[PDB]
Amino acid sequence: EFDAIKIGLASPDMIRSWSFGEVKKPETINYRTFKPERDGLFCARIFGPVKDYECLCGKYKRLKHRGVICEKCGVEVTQTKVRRDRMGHIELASPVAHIWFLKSLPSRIGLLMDMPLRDIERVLYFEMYVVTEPGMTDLERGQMLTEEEYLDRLEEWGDEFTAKMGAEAIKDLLASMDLPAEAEQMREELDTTNSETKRKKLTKRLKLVEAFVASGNKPEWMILTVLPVLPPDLRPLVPLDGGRFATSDLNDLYRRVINRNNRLKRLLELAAPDIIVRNEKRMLQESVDALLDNGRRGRAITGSNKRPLKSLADMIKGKQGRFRQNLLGKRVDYSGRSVITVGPYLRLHQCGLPKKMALELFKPFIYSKLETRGLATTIKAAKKMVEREEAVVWDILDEVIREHPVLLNRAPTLHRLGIQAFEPVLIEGKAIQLHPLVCAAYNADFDGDQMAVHVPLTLEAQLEARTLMMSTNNILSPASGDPIIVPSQDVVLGLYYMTREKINAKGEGMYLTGPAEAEKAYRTKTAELHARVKVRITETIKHENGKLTTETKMIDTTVGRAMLWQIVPKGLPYSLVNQKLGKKQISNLLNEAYRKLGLKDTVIFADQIMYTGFAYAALSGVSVGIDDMVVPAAKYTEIAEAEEEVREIQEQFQSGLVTAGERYNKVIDIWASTNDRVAKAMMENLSSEQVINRQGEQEKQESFNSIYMMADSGARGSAAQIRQLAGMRGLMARPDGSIIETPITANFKEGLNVLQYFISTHGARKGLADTALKTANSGYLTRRLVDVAQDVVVTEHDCGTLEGVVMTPHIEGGDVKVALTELALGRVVSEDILKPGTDEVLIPRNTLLDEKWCKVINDNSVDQIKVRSVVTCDSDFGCCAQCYGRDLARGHLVNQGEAVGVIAAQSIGEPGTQLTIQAKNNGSVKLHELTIIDEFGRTKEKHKLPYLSKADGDAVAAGETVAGGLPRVADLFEARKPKEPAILAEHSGTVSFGKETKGKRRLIITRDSGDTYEEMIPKHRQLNVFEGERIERGDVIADGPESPHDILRLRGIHAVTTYIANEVQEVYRLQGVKINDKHIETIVRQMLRKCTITFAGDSEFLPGETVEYSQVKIANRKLVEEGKEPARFERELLGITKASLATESFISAASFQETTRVLTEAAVSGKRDDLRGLKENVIVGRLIPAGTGFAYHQDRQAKRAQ
């Protein structure tokens, strides 16, 4: 129907054209008949009939008289909904300035007439005159005259000049401007100017003038002469229960405007003193600005209930505004909500749905089927049968829900796994039964959590639920590629208990034909779960090439291990089961099954694993008791020793040998050591036991303590919690941050006393409040990332670029932080991977590095590779498939139409709550910094070189001595400037000292061309450069934190990409969160979207103008095709907020935040929105140009092409 949305100024003729009448009175409704008045705010002649196909006087009261305007009353006989569309207008007695175009800094009016805002308000508030027409007089346009001066110069000259006061004067000045002449004047002066500040001033003014002349708008339209009036049903006056009436504040604001307008019209007939008329004009202006935007001008007007009246800008903007409350999110039908219980009998694709909920949600479907198969003649028959709850209704409900998927959601929806599709199973009850293996994706625990259920209606939605959102498809985490359905808690505990090994268990040394006879022996009480036996195992291996090799052997195992092997699918080695199975082991089992067998086998295996784990955890009988918390006897003696030594050091302090700070520090150290030793003793006592073996001696065995089994299996608990239960609680922190000297020498078994509990509360409160605030901080970060990266969709297959990024293993000392296999798994090769020391092509270009090629690279010892990345792609909009590579959630190449930006934003934002020289290897030494490389050719140590045992190329043996998380990420993504940044060498050249000017110092550099560049350095700066040294570009002059803007300007795109990726991944890896770097690179690509033109060239670009980089690239390609001088640009790093607010679409920018500024700028510039991204199509209800809708939009892009 429509392809674009245009925005611009509203002329008085246009506002009159929108209107169906003029509102003349502040009347709303009658106090007896409750009918609208003529010429009021609810007039039926202006806005439409109150009743469908009726008129106020009631003469024409049927559809026979449709479209006939009644002569007695004037009401058109039509539908009532026209009262939601028809507008009105008010003809203002005096012109009024628009508040948005005046007080939204920078002032468009003030910028246009080149006068300060205070001057314009002084004219508007009726304090000073302004000359409109100077005439044949020394006076100039726009110069102020006070009342006295106006009188003297009126006596001096008379009618030669014209001076006015108020909004009328501003209107005449705006209408008298000759925009092209002013534009030429600014162009010439800019051609002959030197100051940079005046350059910026005239650049903005010229941009505004050019925008006005191009958009077709007229400046005088910023002063309103006719005011539009909103349709009544959007500001309703409705009867409430009990006879009370409810109204919108817009009614009060409009009534004030109309009253003051009528009073002004009356005062201009009963000719009145100029002071009174001036005051009334002031009233009219204040009322109009209050109606448009309350609180911007000054004191916000309040109602009879003493809170500010809500204006139109408040309707439009904010968290409660129409964009975010009703357009980007909605309440939906066919939805329900209930508490969630656990269904251990369910399959991965099934969810338990209560019968009453299904009856309510699927009611139209039930009606349809009852009408179709004939038990209901009409729709009220079906409704009555459903209400009476007959049996056949239940069979019909079963048949409708037979294979109709439903969508389950849990708030907060941190990532796309928070909504998934399941096949419903009707259950008796009122609670939704949820499969345990999906809880980790939902972050759902059964302590009162509630879930929402949605019913997809159309066939397309059903097939999207079955194919995309179904639980069996989403088993890999899109953030990292790891399985997200890994078992936890009782499943892990059962698989651990069944796979443990006991000495001298019943049935030891027995020979079993296979897993079946192990099961038979366990069920017949011949052998225990933990008996060491020999079992015949038939094992089939599926190789990388697909070879299936089957072979049988006798293996020394445990009965439980064979019984578990019974459910392991064919194609997997038996070594994966022949061990005690913790959480890591089960995760490895599932990951290997997915890597070597596929998806269906993986889901069946996961279901069987969870069933078996539950069964054998129930059979184990694991329980917690007070005797399971064994307190080591060494704790009391260690506490006594620490206390005695603390007495000794107190004595030393009393002698003056040591100071107070030293005493504090070493007391902290001794208590920390005591805590560590008590924890070690408790672990050693808890983790072992002595048993009698078959031959009769004593043997050491791993303990079967319930708490130890709980901690070691990885089900619940870690060493810290057992330390708190059976060891020592340790040092705790005072609320300011300081650490109290005396620790809590008690655990939770003997219990704390009053003061120990008080110190515990000190930190407990801090933790809870920190979580409460950090949740909101992370949510706001995730929002910001989503709006910056929302437009990134895979739009192509190959972009045909040769650029790429260089990837090497991460080294932050003497050990590798992460191998290159992890960094390269799933990325496409950009430059051919030659074997080191050879010219053979091991890996061709445009190849996806899967597991097998990763193993090849690991075997051939490759250090540095080149791969395509999102930042280096050349696609005009979005990215291509090769530059992104594998999509982690699916395991194959990324498909066309995937919203990679939203995935990246969700992946980064989800873990936000969890957020807060001696050589050690043998090899050679290389100097660049210091690098120690193994004999295989891999760089394994990277060390700094401050301004050495071995020189360059000298071999070094082992041991030789050559000689705050979330705020950081948020600050990094907005590209903040550090408080004290590093001073960096602007240009490559020879350093030289300069005149130490008072206040702060200056330095100079001589370039290769002999030009001298001056630098402004503060006094307190430990300069590193020395005179006579040729420092390269990118060198550090003053040490300190590095600003990403400087890195981009002086080093390049790759440098800033690497910097951002490394720091954010340092923060994430500190807390043990694994996120792939392609998401971060998508965000960084969205940071690099604007360029400032330095050389204007011949293209329609002004110097120093920040424009979009893709537009410049397209223009430069066109100009190169035309053989004309292309533009020279510098690229800018923009923060996620500033990049989001500077999008080409003003709909997305207005829906993000700062709605007033975006709307004002777009209206002045006459912007046009093409609805190219996701948010715009979400607002207008269209299909998003991503995923299933992608093709659709492409078709339109063909139709507009033809």
Partner 1 sequence: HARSTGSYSLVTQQPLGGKAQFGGQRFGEMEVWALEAYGAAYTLQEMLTV
Partner 2 sequence: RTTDPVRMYMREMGTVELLTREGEIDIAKRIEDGINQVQSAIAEYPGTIPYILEQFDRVQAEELRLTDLISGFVDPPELAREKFNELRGKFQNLQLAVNEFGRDSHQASEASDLVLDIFREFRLTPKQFDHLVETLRTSMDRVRTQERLVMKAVVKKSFIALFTGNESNEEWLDKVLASDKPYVAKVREQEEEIRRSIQKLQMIEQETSLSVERIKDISHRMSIGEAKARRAKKEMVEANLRLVISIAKKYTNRGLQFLDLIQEGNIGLMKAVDKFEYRRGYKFSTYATWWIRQAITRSIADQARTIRIPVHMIETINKLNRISRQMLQEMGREPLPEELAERMQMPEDKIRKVLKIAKEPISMETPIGDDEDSHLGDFIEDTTLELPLDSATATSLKAATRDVLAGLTPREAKVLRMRFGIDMNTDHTLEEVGKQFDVTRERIRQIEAKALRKLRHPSRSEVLRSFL
Residue set of the binding site for Mg(2+) = 445, 447, 449
From the list 53-61, 78-86, 395-403, 1102-1110, the region that binds Zn ion by CB under 5 A is: 53-61
Tell me which residues in 795-814 interact with Zn ion (CB under 5 A).
799
Q: Which does 1183 bind (CB under 5 to 8 A by kind): partner 2, partner 1, Zn ion, none?
A: partner 1
Q: Which of residues 336-395 bind partner 1 (CB under 8 A)?
A: 336-338, 356-357, 360-364
DSSP type of residue 234: G
C-alpha–C-alpha distance, residues 471 and 441, integer Å: 10
Query: Angle, nearest 10°, between helix axes 167-176 and 117-124?
Result: 120
Q: Does 104 bind partner 2 (CB under 8 A)?
A: no
Q: What is the DSSP string of 642-709?
A: HHHHHHHHHHHHHTTSS-HHHHHHHHHHHHHHHHHHHHHHHHHHHSEEEEE-TTSSEEEEE---HHHH
Distance of closest approach, residue 1130 Cβ to partner 1, in angstroms: 33
| Three-state SS sequence of 741-762 | CCCECCCCCCCCCHHHHHHHHH
Nearest Cα neighbor of 224 from 15, 21, 41 is 15
Using rule CB under 5 A, residue 112 touches Zn ion: no
- Residues at the binding site for Zn(2+) are 55, 57, 70, 73, 799, 873, 880, 883
Binding footprint of partner 2, residue count (CB under 8 A): 61
**321 touches partner 2 (CB under 8 A):** no
Asked whether position 266 contacts partner 2 by CB under 8 A, the answer is: yes
Nearest CB to partner 2, comparing residues 31 and 947: 31
Binding-site positions: 55, 57, 70, 73, 445, 447, 449, 799, 873, 880, 883
* Min separation Cβ 827 and Zn ion, Å: 12
Token duo for residue 385 = 């049968």
Interface with partner 2 (CB under 8 A), residue from 177, 183, 283, 312 = 283
User: Binding to partner 1 (CB under 8 A): which residues in 205-264?
Assistant: 233-234, 236, 238
CB 765 within 8 A of CB 1062: no
Cα–Cα–Cα angle for 803, 807, 811, nearest 5°? Answer: 155
Of 43, 70, 115, 284, the residue at the interface with Zn ion (CB under 5 A) is 70
Among 2, 4, 13, 31, binds partner 2 (CB under 8 A): 31
Task: Tell the burial category of 94 from Cβ atoms under 10 Å away from its Cβ (0-12, 13-18, 19+).
Answer: middle
Stretch that binds Zn ion, among 396-404, 523-531, 649-657, 865-873 (CB under 5 A): 865-873
Are 563 and 515 in contact by the 8 Å Cβ rule? The answer is: yes
* Cis-peptide, bond into residue 1018, ω within 30° of zero: no
Q: Which of 1058, 525, 635 is nearest to 805 (CA)?
A: 1058
As measured in angstroms, the least distance from the Cβ of 246 to partner 1 is 10
SS3 labels along 162-201: EEECCHHHHHHHHHHCCHHHHHHHHHHHHHCCCCHHHHHH
Applying CB under 8 A, which part among 26-34, 86-94, 571-579, 1024-1032 lies near partner 2?
26-34
297 binds, among partner 2, partner 1, Mg ion, none (CB under 5 to 8 A by kind): partner 2
Q: Which stretch binds Zn ion (CB under 5 A): 14-22, 51-59, 452-460, 966-974?
A: 51-59
Q: Binding to Zn ion by residue 880, rule CB under 5 A?
A: yes
Q: Which two tokens stand for residue 880?
A: 């291509």
Cβ contact 371:382 at 8 Å = yes
Q: Write down the least CB distance from residue 534 to partner 1, Å.
A: 50
String of contacts with partner 1 for each residue 413-452, x by CB under 8 A: xxxx-xx--------------------------------x
The piece of 558-566, 872-880, 917-925, 1170-1178 that touches Zn ion (CB under 5 A) is 872-880
- Residue 468 to residue 461: CA distance in whole angstroms: 10
Task: Please report whether residue 468 would count as binding partner 1 according to CB under 8 A.
Answer: yes
892 interacts with partner 2 by CB under 8 A: no
Binding residue for partner 2 (CB under 8 A) from 7, 15, 20, 26? 26
Instruction: Please give the DSSP secondary-structure letter assigned to residue 986.
Output: S
Inter-axis angle of helices 900-909 and 754-789, to 10 degrees? 170
Regarding 322 and contact with partner 2 (CB under 8 A), the answer is no
Encoded amino acid at 551, one letter: E
Residue placing its CB nearer to partner 2 in the complex, 110 or 1097: 110
CA 845 to chain centre: 34
Structure tokens at 1122: 């035309």
Q: What six digits make up the tokens of 1149?
A: 């920018």
3-state SS, residue 834: strand
**Looking only at residues 295 through 314 of this chain, which bind partner 2 when binding is defined by CB under 8 A?**
297-299, 301, 303-305, 307, 310
Q: What distances in angstroms separate CA 949 from CA 814, 853, 926, 928, 940, one per listed residue?
A: 17, 39, 13, 16, 18
| CB closer to Mg ion out of 448 and 621 | 448
Of 141, 187, 201, 255, the residue at the interface with partner 2 (CB under 8 A) is 255
- Taking CB under 8 A as the rule, which mask of x and - marks residues 894-933 in contact with partner 1? ---xxx--xx-xx---------------------------
Binding site for Mg ion (CB under 5 A): 445, 447, 449
3-state secondary structure 508-554: CCCEECCHHHHHHHHHCCCCCCCCEEEEEEEEEEECCCCCEEEEEEE
* Residue in 276, 463, 619, 955 binding partner 2, rule: CB under 8 A: 276
Give which of partner 1, partner 2, Zn ion, none residue 329 binds (C-beta under 5 to 8 Å, depending on kind).
partner 1
- Angle, vertex CA 783, rays to CA 782 and CA 784, nearest 5: 90
CB of 411 to Mg ion, least distance (A): 12
| Three-state DSSP class for residue 349 | coil
Q: Which is nearer to partner 1, 40 or 1173 (CB)?
A: 1173
Out of Mg ion, partner 2, partner 1, none, which partner does residue 379 contact, by CB within 5 to 8 A per kind?
partner 2
Element (H, E) at 942: strand 939-943
Show the beta-strand stretches assigned E in 437-531. Answer: 450-454, 511-512
- Map the footprint of partner 1 across residues 1178-1197, applying CB under 8 A: 1178, 1181-1184, 1186-1190, 1192
Residues in touch with partner 2 (CB under 8 A): 26-31, 63-64, 80, 121, 125-127, 236-238, 240, 243-249, 251-252, 255, 259-260, 263, 266-267, 270-273, 275-276, 278-280, 282-283, 286, 297-299, 301, 303-305, 307, 310, 319-320, 377-381, 383
Residues in touch with Zn ion (CB under 5 A): 55, 57, 59, 70, 72-73, 799, 873, 880, 883
